[PDB]
Amino acid sequence: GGVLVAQDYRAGSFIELLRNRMALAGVGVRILQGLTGNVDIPKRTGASTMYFVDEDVDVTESDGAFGLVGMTPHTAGVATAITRRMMQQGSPDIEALVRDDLLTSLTLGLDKTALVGHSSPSAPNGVRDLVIGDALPFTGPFATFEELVDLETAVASANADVDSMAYIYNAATSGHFKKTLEFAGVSGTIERGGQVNGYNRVKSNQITTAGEVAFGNWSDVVIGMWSGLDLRVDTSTKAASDGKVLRVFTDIDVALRNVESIKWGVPA
Amino acid sequence: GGVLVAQDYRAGSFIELLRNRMALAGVGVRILQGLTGNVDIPKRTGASTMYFVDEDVDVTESDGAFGLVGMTPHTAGVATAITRRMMQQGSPDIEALVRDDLLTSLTLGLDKTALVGHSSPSAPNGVRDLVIGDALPFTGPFATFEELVDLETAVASANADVDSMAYIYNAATSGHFKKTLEFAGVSGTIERGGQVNGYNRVKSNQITTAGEVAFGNWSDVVIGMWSGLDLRVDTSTKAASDGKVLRVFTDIDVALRNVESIKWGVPA
Amino acid sequence: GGVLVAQDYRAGSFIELLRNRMALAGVGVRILQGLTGNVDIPKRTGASTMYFVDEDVDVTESDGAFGLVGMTPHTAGVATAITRRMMQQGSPDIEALVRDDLLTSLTLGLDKTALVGHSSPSAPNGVRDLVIGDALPFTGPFATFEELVDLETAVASANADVDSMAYIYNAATSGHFKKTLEFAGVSGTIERGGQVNGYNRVKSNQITTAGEVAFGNWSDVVIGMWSGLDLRVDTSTKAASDGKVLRVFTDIDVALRNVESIKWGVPA
Amino acid sequence: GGVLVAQDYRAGSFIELLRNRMALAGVGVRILQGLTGNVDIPKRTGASTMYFVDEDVDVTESDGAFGLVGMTPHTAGVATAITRRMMQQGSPDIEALVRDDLLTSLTLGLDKTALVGHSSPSAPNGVRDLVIGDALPFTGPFATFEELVDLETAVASANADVDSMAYIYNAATSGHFKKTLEFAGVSGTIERGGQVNGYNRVKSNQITTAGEVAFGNWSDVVIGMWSGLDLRVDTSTKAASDGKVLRVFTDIDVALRNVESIKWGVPA
Amino acid sequence: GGVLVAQDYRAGSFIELLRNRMALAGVGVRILQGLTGNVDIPKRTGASTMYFVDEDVDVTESDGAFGLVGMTPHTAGVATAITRRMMQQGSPDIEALVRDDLLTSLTLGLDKTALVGHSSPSAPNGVRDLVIGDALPFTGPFATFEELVDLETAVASANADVDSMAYIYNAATSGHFKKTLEFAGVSGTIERGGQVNGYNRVKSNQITTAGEVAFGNWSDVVIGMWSGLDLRVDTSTKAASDGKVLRVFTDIDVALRNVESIKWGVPA
Amino acid sequence: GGVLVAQDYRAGSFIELLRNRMALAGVGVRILQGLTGNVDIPKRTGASTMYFVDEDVDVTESDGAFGLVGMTPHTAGVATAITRRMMQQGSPDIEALVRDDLLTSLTLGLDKTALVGHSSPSAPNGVRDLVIGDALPFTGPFATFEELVDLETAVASANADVDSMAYIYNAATSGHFKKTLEFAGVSGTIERGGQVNGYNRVKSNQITTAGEVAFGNWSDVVIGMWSGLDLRVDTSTKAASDGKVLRVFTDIDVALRNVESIKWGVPA
Amino acid sequence: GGVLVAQDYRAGSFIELLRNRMALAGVGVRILQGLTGNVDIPKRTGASTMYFVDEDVDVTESDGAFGLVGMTPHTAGVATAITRRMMQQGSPDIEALVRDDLLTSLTLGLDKTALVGHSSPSAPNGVRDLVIGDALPFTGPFATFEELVDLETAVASANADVDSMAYIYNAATSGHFKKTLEFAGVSGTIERGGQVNGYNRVKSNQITTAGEVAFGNWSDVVIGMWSGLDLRVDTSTKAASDGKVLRVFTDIDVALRNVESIKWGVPA
C-alpha cells in the first residue's frame, strides 16, 4: 500500500481561505461633496493698491481682478468578464469574489489619480500636475533634513499656513528618513515618533517614485463626486455563448483653491 | 442626447465661497497717538564733562548739546469705482467686497511703509530709512548665530538696553533659523519655541528682503496719527452714469526717539 | 576503626533533584491547522485596472490572475528502548523520564526545522529554504543599524507590513547589537530595552549561524499538522524479555502565504 | 488754499516729554565713610615662624613686619554757565535740567574714575592703577574659560578667596562670552543667566576696553568722602550780562586694603 | 639632669586599643544544606535525536545518557597553642583574642577555597578549577566593555541564562572599570552606579590575581556542610608544660551543576 | 593758604581698624589625645593559617605575629622680641598684637608639619614622610581623572577602605580640576559640585607644591598632644636694654595606625 | 341557404392539439448523476491472492493495484429566435411551444453523440469512439449468426457478463435478420420476437450506418450532468424589433467504467 502509484487516493483538499492581494493606502485630510450640474466658485486673485500723494494732488483708481475655479465630471470605470464555465465552477464563487475586487480596485485607483495625475487624456489632472511647475529639486537620490524645511518655507513664504499640514512619501523614502541623523552629531533622527518636522506624515505607497515627497495644507483640496458607485451587472453584452460581464462606473473631478498651498519636491 | 448641444440646459451651479487673496500679517508693539498741528519734542544729546583739578586751580566750563524731533502729516489713500449694472446683479454683495478690501489693503499698506520706507517721494520715512545709515553686514546669504549676538551687543553697547526687545525677520529667513544649529552638534537650533537668544521674534512677511533681520527696543518708535480711517462714499462723480465710487484717506507719520535703539541686518 | 575499608556501612544518599538537559527555547507566534490529504489554497495575484473615458466611450474589459499554494506531509519520528530491569529498580520512575525526553526533544526539533530547514532530503522546506532567494547581504561579520532597518523597508515596500512584526536573531548576535551604537557619536545601542527598532526580538538559538537575522510578519506562515503528537507504547517488539520501546511519530509541513513577508539576513 | 509761504497759520505743537540721554551704570558692593583730615591705617605683613628643637636645644627668634595705607583728598568737579535770555524764554525750567545734568554727570564720573583710573595727573589712583602691575594676559582678542578660572585661582592662591566674589567686564565682552561654549563639545556657554563660573557679574560699560575683565572680593575697596556734593550757585561771575553759573565740587580718594583681593586681566 | 640616657625614668604607657588586621568580604548568593552521609544526585546529559523518514523507512532508536555528581567530606583544621607565661602576662585577654583570630581566619579560608581552589591536595576542588579548562582571554591587563559582554554571550550561547546572574571581580579591577567609558564620547562608565551591563556585581579581594572576572548563575553551585564550626578547646595535649591549645575543625565539599553556568575570564 | 609749609597744621588721623594677615586653613577629620610619658599600642599583624588534612592527619599548629606602634614627643616653639620704646609709644597695644600673632602662627605651623613633614632633623615625621615611599607618579604637571581614581583604587585594594574618606589638594590643584573634563565627551568637571569622585574634598594651601594630592581614611591618624600652648614672658633675656621677649612652647608627635590608609600624589 | 358566399357563419375550427415530429428512439438503460467541478472516480485493478498454509505456516501478502478515470465537461446547446408579431397571434402559447421543440431536440442530440461520437472537435467522444479500437469484422454487408454469438462470447470471457445485456443495431439490419435463417435449412431466423440470441435488442436509428451492431452491458456507460437543462430567455439581443430569443445550454461528458464491457460490429 505504498503511497507512490498504488495508493493515489490522496487528492486535493482545497481549503477556501483565499490569500488576497496586497493593496496600498489612501488619504484622510481633504474635503469633498456630492452634487449635480456644473460647479464654480469665485476667487479674489486681486486687491487694490495704496498710493502716497502730495497735498491737493489727486489719487488714482485701482481695481481688483477676479476669477473663478471650475469642476466638470470626468467619468471613470472598470469592467471585467466571466465566462460560463468559470461561473459554473468557482470555488469561493465568481459572482462575489470579483464583485468586491472591482470596488477595492476602483476606490484606490480614484484615490491615486486624485493625488498623482493619471497619465491619460480625458482624465482629471491630479494635484501633482497642478503644482509640478515649481518642483524643488533635492540634489540627491533622497532628501536631506535641509530640504524638508525648505518645502515648509516655500509654503510659508506665500502666507498660506494653517499650522495643520502633512508630509507624504512612499515607504522606501520613509526607510531613509528612519536611519538618517537629523544633524551632524545631535541625538535625534528625522522621522521620530510619528512626526517629521513637528507635522504629521502618512507614508503612503501611492507616490510610486522613490524619493518624491509632497507637503502643504491639504485642507484646501476639493473633489467633486457627482455620483456614488454603480456596480451594474450585465448579461446581454455576452449572451450568444453564455456569459456574465461585470462593470462599475463613477465620475469625479479634482481642483484646489489656492495654487501655492501645496509644494512638491522631486528627487534630482 | 449628448451633452455637447441638444443639451444646452446644463446649469452652472454657483456657490458663495469667495476667498480673500492671500494677505500678510502686521506687527504691533509700538507707540501711537492722535493729535493735530505740527509736532515737536526736545531731546538732549550732550552732557557735561567732569574735570579733575589739583589744589586751587580753576575748573573748566562744559556745555551740553540739544536737539528736537519733528513730524509732519504725510497723506495716503486708495479708491476704486463700481458701475450700476455690476452693483445690481452681483452674487456676493460687491459693495461689501470692495468696502472690506479697501480697508484691508490700506491697513496692511501703512505699517509696511512704517517698517520699510515706501519707494515713492512724498511718502513718510520708514524705520529702515533712518537706521540703515549704520548696518552690520552678514558675510553670507543669511545670518550665522554669532551675528544675532552682535546685534544684541551693538544695542547694548550704546546702553539702550530694555528687557523687552524683539527680533523681526522675513518668513523666508525663519526657515534658515530652524535648519541650523547654534554650535557644532550642540543639540539646539537657533529658533526654538518662538524665541531666539532668549528674545521674542515676530516672523512677519513684510520684510521683502531675503535675510534682512532687525532688532531693538520697538517701544521707542513713534507714529503720528491725525485722522482714523475715513471712508468717503462718493456718488457725485460718475452720477451721469449712476456709478458710485468708494475712497478712503488717512494721514500718517513716523519717527523714533533714539537712533541707536534699532539695528539692521542687511545680508550680503 | 577508620572509614577507609571494611568499615563501610556509611549510608550513601540519593536525592531526587535532577539536573536537566539545558535545551533551547521556542518561538510560537504562528498559525496552524489539522488536515487530511494534500491541501491547496487559492491565492489572488492580480488586480483589475480602471479606465478614464469621456461621454459615449466604451470601457475596456480587464481581468486578474490567480494562483495557489500547496502543502504535503513530511514525517518526523523519534524512538527509544527501555528494558525490564531499569523499570524494576529505577530511582525516579524511568518511564516518565523517557516520555518527557521524547516529547520535548521532538517539539524542539519541529520548531528548529520550521525556521531553518533540516539537512535530510526527506525534510520539510524551512522558511529559510523558501525566502533565501531574496537575500540581503551584510558586507561584514554582522549587520549595522543601516541594514537592520533596510530589512524593514524591504518588507514595508510591498504593503505587507502589520503593526506587530518581530525580529529573530541568534543568541550570539544579541550581544553584538548590545555592544554597538546605532550612530557614531550619539548615545544609545541597538538592542535597547528588549526591542531593536520599535519591534520585538525573540533571541532564540534555533538560528545556528552567527549573524543571520530574520524579520517579517510572523502571522503569514502556516504549518500543517496532519496529526497530533501521538504516543505509542509498543510492548510487543521486545516481549521476548519484556522490554518496552516508546516511540512518537508526527508528519507536518510548512508554507507561507505571501513570499514578501519575511526577509533573511545571511551575513557575508 | 494749500500750504504755502502765504498759507501757514499752522502752529508748532511743543510737547514736553524730553527724550533723555543714554547714561551708563555703576557698582553696589563697596564701602566708604564721611571723613576729615588725613587717614592712615596700619596693616600687618608677615608673621613669626615656627622652629623645631631638640631636648634642651636653643630656640631662636623671628619678627613680623608692618605697614600702613593712606588716603588724601583729590579734588574734582564740573561746572557750566547759562545766560540770561535763555532763562527768560525756556521751554522747560532751563535751570533744573542743568542741575540734574551736573549731579549725575559728576556721580558717574567719580564712579568711572574710581574703578578704572582716570588718565590725567592730579587724579586719584584707580583700582586699575593699583593692581595692573601683576596683570594677567589673555593671548586673544577676548578671554577664554581657562583664564576665566585662572582669575579665580590667582585670588584663591593668596588665601584672599572669600565666598562673595564677582566678575566685572565691559558690555561688549558679554556677548562674546555668550556666543562661546565652555568646552569643545559639551552644551554650555560661558555666561549663563546672571552667572559666570558660579559667581555673579555686573556687566557695566565703565571699562572702556573690550577684552578687560576684573575679578575679586570687592569688599576690600575703600573710598573716602571728605565732603558731600556742594552745588554752589554763582552770580558774581558773568554779571555784566546777568548770567548765572552752576558749579559742583567734591573731593575723594580710593585705596584698597589687600592688594591681592582683586585680580585684573588684560587682552593681548 | 637630662632626658636622653642614664636618666630615663619615664615609664612607657601601654594602651589597650588593639589595631586589628584587615579582612576580606566573601559571597552571599549560592545555596547549601546540612547532611550526614555521601550524597549523589542524578543529571541527564544526553537526549534522543529526531529523525525524518523516507516513506516506509523504520525510525532508528536513540538512547539518552545519564550521570550524577557526588560530594564527599573534605576536612579542614586550624590550630595554635599559647603557652603558660604568655597567658600570665597579657595586656588583652590573650585567649579571648586567639579564639577570635581562629574563627575569622577559618571562615575566610573556607570562603576563599570554595571560590578559588586551594593549592593543596586533599582539598575540595574549587569552582575555578572546574571551569578554568576553557577560559576567555582578554588581550590586555583588563577587559574592556566588548570583551566584557563576551562573558554574557558565552553563557547565553549555552541556554543557561537566568534572570539573576552576577559578576565577581577583584577590587583592583573595579578601579579599572569605574574610570573607563562604555563607548567613546558617550556619557557612561562601565561600572556605573552599582551594576554592570544591567547585572549586579560583588567586589571582593578573594580573587588574588589582577584582572580575573567571573560571571554566571551562582545559584547553580551547591556546597555541603557536614558539621558546623566547633571550638573544642584543649588542655591535656601540651600538659607537660602548662599550655592552652585551641583547634577548630570543619569538613565541607563543593560541587557544581551545569558546568556551563559559570564562565571565567583571565587577563592575558 | 595753600597746602604746603604754609599749611602744616593739618593733622594725621590714625584709625585702629587693623588688617589681619591672611592665613591658611586646617583639618577637621583626625583624632588626638592629651597624655604624659611615652606611649605605644599593640597592633596584630599576623593571621593563623589553615590546612586541609587527610582522613586521619593532625592539623599542623601555626602561629601569628604581633606588632607594636608608638610615638615620642617632639618639641617645637616660637619666639619674638620687643624693645622698650616700641612698647612705650604703641598705637595699638603692641604686646597684644604679638601675643595674638604667636598663638596662631604656632597652631598653623603645628598643623602644617603634621600634614606634610617638616624639612629639618628633630622634627616629627609628617604623614607625607611615612607614605612617600608608596607614592604614585602623575606623568604630567597635574593629574587626570585616571590617577584621581587610581589613588582610591590602590587604597581600597588593601581592604583598608571605609565609607568616610576625603581628598586633600592644594588650591591650584582644585582650580585645575575645575577647568578640565574627565572624559572629553562627558559633561562635568573633575571637581563637579563639592565632591570629586563621590567623596568629599578639602583644599588648603598647607600643601606647598603644585599638584600633590592625598587621599584615604583620615580617621587613622593619631596626634600626641603632650602639653598645651605654653606662654612665657621673658624679661631677663636682654635687660641691658630693658627689652622683654615672648616665647611659646608646645610638644607634639604624630603617627598613623594602619599604614596603608593613605597615599600620595607627587606630580612628576 | 347553401354553403357558399351566402353562408359566412362557419369559422376556422382550429383544434389546438398539435401533431408532432418523427423523432428517433433513445436508450434509457444507462447511469447518470449531478455534480460540480472537475471529477474523477477511483477504480480497482487486480487483487490479493489466497494461500493454503499447513498446520503452522504464516500466510503471505499480495499488493492490490489501483487506477482512476476522469471526465471533463464538454458543452452544447441550441437556440432559435421569435419575432414580436408571432407572440401576439400564436394559437398555442408560442414560447411554451418552442420550449419543447428545444428540449427534445437537445436530449435526442445528446443521446446521438453519446452512443456514436459527433464528428466535430470540442465534442465528447462517444462510446463508439472509445471501444472501436478492437471490433470483429464481418466479411459482408451484414453478420451471420457466428459473429452475433462471438459478440457475446468475447464479452462473457472477460467476466463482464450480466444477465440484462442488449444488442443494438439500425432498423435495416433488423429487417435483414428477420428475413434470413441462422443456418441453411434451419427454421429459426436470426431475429424473432423481442430477442436475437436470447437477449433483447433496441432497433434504433441513432446508428446512421448500416450493418454496424453493438452489444454489451449498457449499465456501464456513465454520463455526467454538470448542470440541469437550464432555459435562458434573451430579450436584449434583437431588442430593436422587440423580438426575443430562446436559448438552452448544458455541459455533459460520457465515459464507461469498464472498457471491455462493450463490443462493436463495424461490418465490411
Residue numbers in the entry:
A (entry chain D), B (entry chain E), C (entry chain C), D (entry chain A), E (entry chain G), F (entry chain F), ...: 24 to 291
The paper states:
We recently characterized a novel roseophage, vB_DshS-R4C (R4C), that could infect the Dinoroseobacter shibae DFL12T, a ubiquitous group of Gram-negative α-proteobacteria of the Roseobacter clade. Here, we report the atomic capsid and in-situ structures of the tail machine of the marine siphophage, vB_DshS-R4C (R4C), which infects Roseobacter. The R4C virion, comprising 12 distinct structural protein components, has a unique five-fold vertex of the icosahedral capsid that allows genome delivery. In this study, we use cryo-electron microscopy (cryo-EM) and structure prediction to determine the atomic structure of the phage R4C capsid and the in-situ structure of the tail machinery to characterize the distinguished long rigid tail.
